[PDB]
């Protein structure tokens, strides 16, 4: 049985898996704050039932694929996946709209990466406040920087019934939020334990990858239905597949943050190796790491100047970052990383100082 085919989907549909209720947190919008995520950590998926308190702005649930076309443009080239889990290709949006309303489902076409930040649609959607507060690119990417800035904050997803996206780790080790405006999406979520990552890498490389349901190889594969008006936040590194059971229109975006830097670096390294994408959807990952390194040093200096202590998660994140910094700048690795280092950063000193501040904060 080939992954993505109609028989594969018919079978997937009848499966139950482990209940998402065993792992997800379900705060209200008002409860999902920075403090909440610092205290709770952001290590399991978070499903918010109603959008109230999330600080989003969205069109009404009456919004359509035709509307998307109007705000984005008929002529926009968009990446489409032919859900016979086969190929990628470009398509004019108007041609997709034609396919969509045609109702002809001989080919199952899925749109999941229409980034609309530079279109009129951008004015109609504001992302969750928590994301805007956490996001590295949003808060810590310097205006003066001359590197290409990642542009992955606003995606529109348009998925016909029976769309399937196979298990993957989100690009660049990012976390992601998804809001289903209409229809439903089913996420199959797997925790990125070292053990699961090993199985994932093995499966990603196996010759019969398209015939093996990854969720079967792990201890726990959690099924999470995200229905109309609901918002899902997936933490760094979580391995997941998505079945679209009914026609779905959704919005989402990808971000990096400081809550679990070790997991972020790890997810980044693994996905970089395993990805079959032709482009880095998150360019200059390392660059932003360097800037964050300096900012975290500043935080530690400040806390010490004021006789206060950092939260544990920051200490650990700063340490894992510093390990990465040393690895990227070793004599023999430097050639493959130098290009990503901002010309304003003195790496040897940043590393030395970070190490010092971190030593003055352990026990």
Ligand X SMILES: OC[C@H]1O[C@@H](O)[C@H](O)[C@@H](O)[C@@H]1O
Q: How far apart are CA 19 and CA 224, in angstroms?
A: 7
Interface of this chain with a copy of itself, residues 52 to 111, rule: CB under 8 A: none
Residue placing its CB nearer to ligand X in the complex, 103 or 335:
103
Residue 101 interface partner, choices Ni ion, a copy of itself, ligand X, none, CB cut-off 5-8 Å depending on type: ligand X
Q: How far apart are CA 267 and CA 226, in angstroms?
A: 24
Consult the annotation and say whether 185 binds a ligand.
Answer: yes
Eight-state DSSP code of residue 25: B
The only residue of 85, 168, 179, 191 in contact with ligand X, by rule CB under 6 A: 168
Consult the annotation and say whether 257 binds a ligand.
Answer: no
Residue placing its CB nearer to a copy of itself in the complex, 27 or 94:
27
Site membership for a copy of itself, residue 208 (CB under 8 A): no
Site membership for a copy of itself, residue 35 (CB under 8 A): yes
Task: Give 247's contacts (C-beta < 8 A, 6+ positions apart).
Answer: 159, 160, 161, 182, 183
118-132 b/e (C-beta count within 10 Å ≥ 16 → b): ebebeebbebbbbbe
Interface of this chain with a copy of itself, residues 1 to 30, rule: CB under 8 A: 22-23, 25, 27
Radius of gyration of the chain (CA): 21
Partner residues linked to 316 by β-bridges:
none
Q: How far apart are CA 255 and CA 272, in angstroms?
A: 16
Residue in 201, 337, 333, 199 with CA at minimum distance from that of residue 270? 201
Interface of this chain with a copy of itself, residues 137 to 196, rule: CB under 8 A: 191, 193-195
Q: How far apart are CA 74 and CA 69, in angstroms?
A: 6
Total residues contacting ligand X (rule CB under 6 A)? Answer: 14
Q: Smallest distance, Å, CB 309 to a copy of itself?
A: 6
Residue placing its CB nearer to a copy of itself in the complex, 80 or 265:
265
Site membership for ligand X, residue 335 (CB under 6 A): no
CA angle (141 as vertex; 357, 256 as ends), nearest 5: 80
Site membership for a copy of itself, residue 240 (CB under 8 A): no
Interface of this chain with ligand X, residues 82 to 121, rule: CB under 6 A: 100-101, 103
Binding mask 166-195 for Ni ion (x = CB under 5 A): ----x-------------------------
Annotated binding site for substrate: 165, 185
Q: Please report, in range form, the residues annotated as the binding site for Fe cation.
A: 168, 170, 240
């Amino acid at each position: 049985v080939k992954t993505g085919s109609p028989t594969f989907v018919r079978e997937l549909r009848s499966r139950t898996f482990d209940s998402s209720d065993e792992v997800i947190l379900k705060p209200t919008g008002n409860q999902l704050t920075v403090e909440f995520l610092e205290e709770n950590s952001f290590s399991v998926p978070i499903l918010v039932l109603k959008k109230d308190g999330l600080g989003m702005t969205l069109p009404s649930p009456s919004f359509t694929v035709r509307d998307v076309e109007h705000y984005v443009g008929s002529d926009k080239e968009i990446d489409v996946i032919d859900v016979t889990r086969q190929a990628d290709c470009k398509m004019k949006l108007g041609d997709f709209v034609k396919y969509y309303y045609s109702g002809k489902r001989e080919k199952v076409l899925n749109v999941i990466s229409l980034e609309f930040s530079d279109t009129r649609l951008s004015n109609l959607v504001e992302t969750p406040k928590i994301v805007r507060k956490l996001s590295w690119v949003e808060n810590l990417w310097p205006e003066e920087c001359v590197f290409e800035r990642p542009n992955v904050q606003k995606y529109c997803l348009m998925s016909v019934r029976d769309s399937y996206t196979d298990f993957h780790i989100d690009f660049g080790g990012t976390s992601v939020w998804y809001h289903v405006l209409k229809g439903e999406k089913i996420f199959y979520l797997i925790r990125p334990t070292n053990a699961n990552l090993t199985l994932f890498e093995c499966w990603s490389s196996s010759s019969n990858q398209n015939e093996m349901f990854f969720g079967d190889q792990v201890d726990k594969c959690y099924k999470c239905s995200v229905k109309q008006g609901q918002t899902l936040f997936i933490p760094t590194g979580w391995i997941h597949a998505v079945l679209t059971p009914v026609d779905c229109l959704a919005f989402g975006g990808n971000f990096l943050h400081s809550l679990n830097i070790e997991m972020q670096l790890k997810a980044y390294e693994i996905e970089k190796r395993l990805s079959t994408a032709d482009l880095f959807r998150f360019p200059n990952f390392e660059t932003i790491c360097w800037y964050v390194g300096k900012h975290i040093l500043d935080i530690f200096r400040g806390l010490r100047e004021n006789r206060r202590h950092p939260a544990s998660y920051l200490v650990h994140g700063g340490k894992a970052l510093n390990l990465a910094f040393r690895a990227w700048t070793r004599k023999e690795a430097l050639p493959d990383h130098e290009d990503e280092i901002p010309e304003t950063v003195r790496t040897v000193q940043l590393i030395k100082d970070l190490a010092r501040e971190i030593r003055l904060v352990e026990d």
